[PDB]
Write a protein that binds this ligand. Sequence first.
Ligand SMILES: CC(C)CN(C[C@@H](O)[C@H](Cc1ccccc1)NC(=O)O[C@H]1CO[C@H]2OCC[C@H]21)S(=O)(=O)c1ccc(N)cc1
Ligand SMILES: [Cl-]
Ligand SMILES: [Cl-]
Ligand code: NA
Lengths: 99, 99
Amino acid sequence: PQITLWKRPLVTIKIGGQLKEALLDTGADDTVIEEMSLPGRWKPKMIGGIGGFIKVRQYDQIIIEIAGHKAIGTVLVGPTPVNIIGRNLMTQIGATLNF
Amino acid sequence: PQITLWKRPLVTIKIGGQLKEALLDTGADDTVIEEMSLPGRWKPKMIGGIGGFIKVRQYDQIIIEIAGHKAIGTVLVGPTPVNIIGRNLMTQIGATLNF
Ligand SMILES: CC(C)CN(C[C@@H](O)[C@H](Cc1ccccc1)NC(=O)O[C@H]1CO[C@H]2OCC[C@H]21)S(=O)(=O)c1ccc(N)cc1
Ligand SMILES: [Cl-]
Ligand SMILES: [Cl-]
Ligand code: NA
């Protein structure tokens, strides 16, 4: 699609067998999801934004379906106030900003 | 232009006669820039990101060039780690997300 920015660019994702809503966020380097279980190994990470840092679990090689488009990559899991799809996965679905 | 997301989508802005770099950020409702002087009165605002909230100064009807496009609108000033152009001004320059 072409998604205008009058409202938050929310999309449906599928991750870990679960359907969720997430924000397409060009200002996020990494994808960060609210607490949930994911399979395999993880390692701890700190990520920072406005407000400061939160501690997250970094899971690699996670498949996510984003608006119907499959992508694989790193997913960070932790106490984010919103599920955010970052550039690491947006590149994989061919997302661009146009003006 | 068409901006891919392999790198941070940084653009040049001009505000108060000064060039700055800023991030086109679809996950930001609001434009928030690092401390600087702007004309007129400001109003209080709290914004919440990853990390928690911060207090900012809200300036309305500020003239700002973004990647060579004129916008006039609300600019928040506060301790953001990076200058961020949010949806409020990205809509003024006609930006969309496409995939
Ligand atoms: C501040 C940016 C440089 C970085 N952020 C992404 C940004 O899009 C967040 C993403 C976001 C969105 C909602 C809540 C928390 C974080 N937006 C944000 O803080 O926007 C604030 C300004 O406008 C407001 O509208 C949204 C909250 C306000 S971040 O959420 O801190 C972040 C940092 C690292 C990663 N990997 C992923 C996300
Ligand atoms: Cl990745
Ligand atoms: Cl590409
Ligand atoms: Na893994």
